């Protein structure tokens, strides 16, 4: 592109997650590839690669390699829905990750800290670059968005008790969700910087499949929203 | 003669079958994809790519991504070796998956069933073809081996209550490991075939008294052994 423009692949998991940045992606085209629809545009001074992966670690895992190596993206950011689970924090706030962990990942037996998988590190470290601008796009909002530690795991997480074992495991996790964390070993193994950032959509209690329901369409936007100021504010 | 010959993608965790596969490929190439190495060249009847297996569910699918995309994969073939969970089974046997399932995955809130992504089946099916014929690759050899079920999660689980709760859960489970229902799920995406195989490094009451990654040295080239074969097998 010109300048500095970057190609960026953005990954959400569901399509309440990409539709708004769908409806702003200018010169856009569809592609299939591996049987998921990717499409291309342009918004602000960057060129965007957009998808809807699916759920999950395996699902959003592949569309970072295909982003990477078939559309030749630059950086990888997802967005989307996550359950609330630090105090101070409630349904509609927006969380950007400074780093990702797995709360599922249980390689101790063979001398790794929990968390981590074997042959990576315990913590993904979003690139500061885009650290930076987010939480200066959150400050300019003046209410409740934090920058902080986002866990991952393959579980939709509804009860305390759930809740409970990942706070212990990491006392200073915001909020929980089914992709951060893949999306940043995946693109971290590519060498390409990352971020994610989520809005709440429920506090992961037991009854947490209701709240989502209610509250999965504002969430989806409220994350795509914030996402596209730091487009604005990525310079070239 | 139908579909002629076909690439085919082994995903080869134990190294001394990869060293054994390429060895034998005719026109060996060496390829970096996404930071690792992929071997490309002919056997028997087949185009191959070798790779060796990385851990995890995100390094599984990022593997089943870039060979169907890069390297024109048009199945999957995933071997390595795990300890065996059901009481029947011996050091060394094989065990052939036909479905594999996750022990790991929760998002039972929403009405899914234990172990079932989002989005996904419970049980995702290895090729019926390929299950077949491996069977018979096994009984022509007079190996020993069993057909079934082999459950995956992120975590290795090492402690025996660990173990009798994922047997509760899924009653006729033969094996637990690392990659196999991320393999499956991915390669399942992408609408390939593929199947799983393990050899059984240690019985489910432990009687082994050699350690796994010893275990390995003899079964990756007993299993490279039974590989050729099966590709021999493989019709065009
Ligand atoms: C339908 S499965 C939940 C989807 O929404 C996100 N998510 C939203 N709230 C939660 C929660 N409480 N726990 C786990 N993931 C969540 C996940 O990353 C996944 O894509």
Redo the contacts between chains.
């Keep these: 592109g010109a300048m500095g423009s970057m190609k960026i692949g953005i990954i959400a998991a569901m399509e309440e997650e990409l539709s708004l940045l769908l409806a702003n992606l200018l010169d856009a085209q569809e592609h299939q590839?591996?049987?998921?629809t990717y499409y291309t545009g342009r918004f602000g001074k960057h060129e965007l690669i957009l998808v809807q992966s699916?759920?999950?670690?395996?699902?959003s895992?592949?569309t970072?390699?295909?982003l990477?190596?078939?559309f030749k993206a630059q950086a990888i950011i997802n967005t989307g829905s996550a359950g609330a689970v630090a105090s101070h924090l409630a349904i509609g706030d927006v969380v950007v990750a400074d780093r990702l962990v797995?709360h599922?990942?249980?390689?101790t037996?063979?001398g790794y800290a929990y968390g981590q998988?074997?042959?990576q590190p315990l913590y993904y470290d979003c690139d500061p670059q885009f650290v930076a601008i987010f939480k200066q796009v959150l400050k300019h909002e003046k209410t409740n968005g934090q920058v902080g530690l986002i866990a991952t795991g393959?579980?939709?997480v509804?009860?305390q008790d759930?809740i409970d074992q990942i706070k212990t495991a990491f006392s200073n996790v915001l909020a929980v969700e089914?992709e951060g964390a893949?999306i940043a070993?995946?693109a971290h193994?590519?060498?390409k910087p990352f971020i994610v950032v989520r809005a709440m959509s429920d506090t992961a209690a037991?009854?947490?499949?209701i709240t989502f329901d209610q509250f999965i369409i504002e969430a989806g936007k409220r994350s795509a929203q914030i996402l596209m100021t730091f487009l604005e504010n990525l310079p070239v």
Tied chains: 1, 2.
């Design positions: 590839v591996l049987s998921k699916g759920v999950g670690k395996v699902m895992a592949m970072v390699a295909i990477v190596e078939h797995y599922d990942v249980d390689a037996a063979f998988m074997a042959g393959d579980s939709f509804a009860g759930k089914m893949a070993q995946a193994t590519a060498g037991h009854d947490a499949n």
